[PDB]
Design a binder for this molecule. Structure first.
Ligand SMILES: *Cc1[nH]c(Cc2[nH]cc(CCC(=O)O)c2CC(=O)O)c(CCC(=O)O)c1CC(=O)O
Length: 289
């Protein structure tokens, strides 16, 4: 029959389309009368959505801006994937087993700093590209290992043949929003928001909300050595782990806070880390970029 067609904007990478299709598939499980169509195409997708050329987009939470364009909203945050960083070693060694002088590929200051805090006898080397591209570079270039989000390898069904060690947050505190998806739509698209509700996972959303509040107040992002990971405790409170590190790994600010309200705990986390010198550190790093 004649039903509303929801147009879903997506990047063209294997991962992006996979994430986008996952979302569509879960939405279809409600059995409501909507058609979905992907339009292969964060900010340019946002412009299209504002212009009503698309109705929604599925982004990796960790790549979302602190502030959405007025008129847009994160309409849904589904049940989180694995939040953990993953080590993929060419010759199958766990982190502490990598040879002295091992070359670990990442363009993330957050990842490289944490690794360097544990081991000063490894080398962090810049690497870029989509996750497949990066796996090909690990094979074909001078890297002994790489770090990737466990979530992307999971989504692709690649983990089994790649992951050498899943890194616990004790070892590597994840990027804010890692493993979470931001399903972005217009704030006034009430029909769509209503459809997205059954997909929203309140415990994921609350945790991520705390992480983001902290990141916003610290003025962090992908380019800065800042981390935050919130989980829901069995008791129902959120526990937020917050971290800022010097790029060489020698100075770590790291704190835990537990509470009910994501805004209050994210804010208090930023206040505490800022009071310890973490914001000055981030400001100085940005000065040398
Ligand atoms: C903020 C940031 N983005 C990226 C590149 C990126 N974005 C999403 C993913 C997939 C995992 C997910 O959806 O959560 C990826 C790639 C990946 O991490 O697998 C980075 C990576 C920089 C790098 O390591 O070179 C970052 C920064 C960060 O994670 O600290």
């Amino acid at each position: 029959s004649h039903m509303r067609k929801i147009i879903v904007g997506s990047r063209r990478s294997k991962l992006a389309l996979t994430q986008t299709k996952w979302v569509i598939e879960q939405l279809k499980k409600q059995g409501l009368p909507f058609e979905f169509e992907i339009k292969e195409m964060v900010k340019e997708i946002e412009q299209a959505m504002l212009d009503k050329e698309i109705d929604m987009a599925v982004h990796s939470m960790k790549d979302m801006p602190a502030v959405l364009p007025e008129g847009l909203t994160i309409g849904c945050i589904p049940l989180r994937e694995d939040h953990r960083d993953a080590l993929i070693s060419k010759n199958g060694e766990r982190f502490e087993e990598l040879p002295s002088g091992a070359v670990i590929g990442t363009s993330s200051l957050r990842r490289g700093a944490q690794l360097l805090s544990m081991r000063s006898d490894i080398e962090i080397k810049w690497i870029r590209g989509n996750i497949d591209t990066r796996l090909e570079k690990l094979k074909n270039e001078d890297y002994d290992a790489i770090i990737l989000a466990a979530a992307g390898l999971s989504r692709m069904g690649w983990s089994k043949d790649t992951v050498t060690q899943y890194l616990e947050p004790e070892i590597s505190v994840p990027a804010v929003g890692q493993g979470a998806l931001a399903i972005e739509c217009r704030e006034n698209d009430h029909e769509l928001l209503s459809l997205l509700q059954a997909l929203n996972h309140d415990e994921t959303a609350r945790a991520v909300r705390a992480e983001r509040v902290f990141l916003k107040e610290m003025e962090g992002g992908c380019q800065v050595p800042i981390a935050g990971y919130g989980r829901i405790l069995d008791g129902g409170n959120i526990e937020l782990t917050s971290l800022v590190a010097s790029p060489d790994g020698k100075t770590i600010y790291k704190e835990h806070i537990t509470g009910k309200d994501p805004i209050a705990i994210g804010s208090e986390a930023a206040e505490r880390l800022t009071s310890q010198g973490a914001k000055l550190l981030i400001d100085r790093v940005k000065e040398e970029l």
